[PDB]
């Protein structure tokens, strides 16, 4: 294992925005993407600003292989931001949990992206390094299991979990709670979900729920 802090929590560094609520629109991928970029924006500019998930839903569309409320990719969302030369703030381009026409306006730009990096498949050591040295990392997890929806506390370990990931989330840290290593994950199902919108998921337990399957992070 690499030399790195035993625990990280980017919330303590003011790099994580409020937990969002995606409602009945499958835009987790867009929440995951903007979450990652939000952290980089704070690191670069000193300002913590929620970015427009809606902008991705409406604008990073077929050209990026995305389907708005019916799914998409965090990496191709980053590419859209690069190509588009920006993304609007959440305040300026609010989230309506539906597919809408692209309404991007550079007058409302709140961040840029120059590149993104996809981490190697399933490597939790590399993910740890990135979370420690780069910032929060966009990942997908297998969130299909009834136990996920009902998670309240502790470290989530579900024997039935798979590496077939279906839900974009954000790794904002990691640590150890009562001898269980975890990844600290920001979800987008509101504050009602889990621990004020967060879930601790099992770390170094065989890429549990595929958390380290498809990690990426952007740079400004
Ligand atoms: C409540 O959170 C949700 C959980 C599941 C869903 N299902 C529909 C939306 N699906 C998704 O967002 C998945 C998640 C993605 C993010 C993490 C890395 C890879 C997997 N992404 C996705 N599905 C696609 C289908 C066709 C074309 C592109 C697609 O992109 C919707 C929302």
Curated annotation (Swiss-Prot):
Disulfide bonds: 15-113, 25-69, 59-102, 161-209
Record's catalysed reaction(s): Similar to cathepsin L, but with much less activity on Z-Phe-Arg-|-NHMec, and more activity on the Z-Val-Val-Arg-|-Xaa compound
Subunit description: Monomer.
GO CC terms of this entry: collagen-containing extracellular matrix; endolysosome lumen; extracellular region; extracellular space; ficolin-1-rich granule lumen; intracellular membrane-bounded organelle; late endosome; lysosomal lumen
Keywords from the named record: Cytoplasmic vesicle, Disulfide bond, Glycoprotein, Hydrolase, Lysosome, Protease, Secreted, Signal, Thiol protease, Zymogen
Superkingdom field: Eukaryota
Enzyme Commission code: 3.4.22.27
Source organism: Homo sapiens
Localization: Lysosome; Secreted; Cytoplasmic vesicle, Phagosome
Enzyme kind, highest EC tier: hydrolase
Native organism taxonomy: Eukaryota, Metazoa, Chordata, Craniata, Vertebrata
GO BP terms: adaptive immune response; antigen processing and presentation; antigen processing and presentation of exogenous peptide antigen via MHC class II; antigen processing and presentation of peptide antigen; basement membrane disassembly; cellular response to thyroid hormone stimulus; collagen catabolic process; extracellular matrix disassembly
Family from the record: Belongs to the peptidase C1 family.
Primary gene name: CTSS
Chief location category: other
Catalytic residues of the enzyme: 28, 167, 187
Function: Thiol protease. Key protease responsible for the removal of the invariant chain from MHC class II molecules and MHC class II antigen presentation. The bond-specificity of this proteinase is in part similar to the specificities of cathepsin L.
MF GO annotations: collagen binding; cysteine-type endopeptidase activity; cysteine-type peptidase activity; fibronectin binding; laminin binding; proteoglycan binding; serine-type endopeptidase activity
Record-given protein name: Cathepsin S
């Amino acid at each position: 294992n690499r030399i790195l802090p035993d625990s990280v929590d980017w919330r303590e560094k003011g790099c994580v925005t409020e937990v969002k609520y995606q409602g009945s629109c499958g835009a987790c991928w867009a929440f995951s993407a903007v979450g990652a970029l939000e952290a980089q924006l704070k690191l670069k500019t000193g300002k913590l600003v929620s970015l427009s998930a809606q902008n991705l839903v409406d604008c990073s569309t077929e050209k990026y292989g995305n389907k708005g409320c019916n799914g998409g990719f965090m990496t191709t969302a980053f590419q859209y931001i690069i190509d588009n030369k920006g993304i609007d703030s959440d305040a300026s381009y609010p989230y309506k949990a539906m597919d809408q026409k692209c309404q991007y306006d550079s007058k409302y730009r709140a961040a840029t992206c120059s590149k993104y990096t996809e981490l190697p498949y399933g490597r939790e050591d590399v993910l740890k390094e990135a979370v420690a040295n780069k910032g929060p990392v966009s990942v997908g997890v297998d969130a299909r299991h009834p136990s996920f929806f009902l998670y309240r506390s502790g470290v989530y370990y579900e024997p039935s979990c798979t590496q077939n990931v279906n839900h974009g989330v954000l790794v904002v840290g990691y640590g150890d709670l009562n001898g269980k290593e975890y990844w600290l994950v920001k979800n987008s199902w509101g504050h009602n979900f889990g621990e004020e919108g967060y879930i601790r998921m099992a770390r170094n337990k065989g890429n549990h729920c595929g958390i380290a399957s498809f990690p990426s992070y952007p740079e400004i």
